[PDB]
Amino acid sequence: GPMGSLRNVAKIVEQIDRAVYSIDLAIYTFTSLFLADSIKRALQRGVIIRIISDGEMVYSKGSQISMLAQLGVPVRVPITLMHNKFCIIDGFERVEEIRLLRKRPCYSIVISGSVNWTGNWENCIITADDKLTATFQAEFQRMWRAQIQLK
């Protein structure tokens, strides 16, 4: 229900607000203005953000991916199915990666939800279990390396 979704989105925005180093987001469609703005604020905070999404859904109405890509957020797209959408905040491997390329404490958080083909965030799970955050982060690294990267 809309209520459960709003509560879930609110919890996610809170995690985004706490992001220190990185946010990796794999999502089929991005329609949440609230989620986007939180990500926008993270970007302004110095957080490194990457987005993987679907080509059919980036030019859909209410798609917020357009404005994030305009701000410099790299968006990679397969052209042209996921078991779930997910967000990894400060993944261990990713933070260590950033640390090397650039020479503060944090803790990995993965948010996952059901894929919506048309913000909507039911079946939401938020966890810091490092085994899970690792598999998701590793999975993102793989998908990122594979693919259209939006100009």
Layout: helices, strands, pairs:
Elements: H1 2-18, E1 22-26, H2 33-45, E2 48-52, H3 65-69, E3 75-77, E4 85-89, H4 92-102, E5 109-113, E6 125-127, H5 130-145, E7 148-149
Helix pairs in contact: 1-2
PDB class: hydrolase
Keywords: phospholipase D fold, HKD motif, nuclease/phospholipid hydrolase, nucleic acid/phospholipid, hydrolase
Assembly: monomeric
What does this protein look like?
It is a single chain. This protein is an alpha/beta fold and 151 residues long. The chain has a single domain, classed as Endonuclease, Chain A, CATH 3.30.870. Strand 1, helix 2 and strand 2 form a beta-alpha-beta unit. It starts with a helix and ends with a strand. It is classed as hydrolase.
Number of DSSP helical runs: 5
Q: Total number of β-strand segments?
A: 7
- How far do the termini sit from each other? 36 Å
Tertiary shape:
globular
Topology as a string of helices (H) and strands (E): HEHEHEEHEEHE
How many separate domains? 1
Largest sheet, strands/sense/barrel: 7 strands, mixed
Strand order of the largest sheet: 6-5-4-1-2-3-7
CATH architecture type: 2-Layer Sandwich
Radius of gyration: 14 Å
CATH superfamily: Endonuclease Chain A
What is the SS-derived class?
A: alpha/beta
EC number: 3.1.4.-
Organism: Drosophila melanogaster (Fruit fly)
Membrane topology: Single-pass membrane protein
Enzyme class: hydrolase
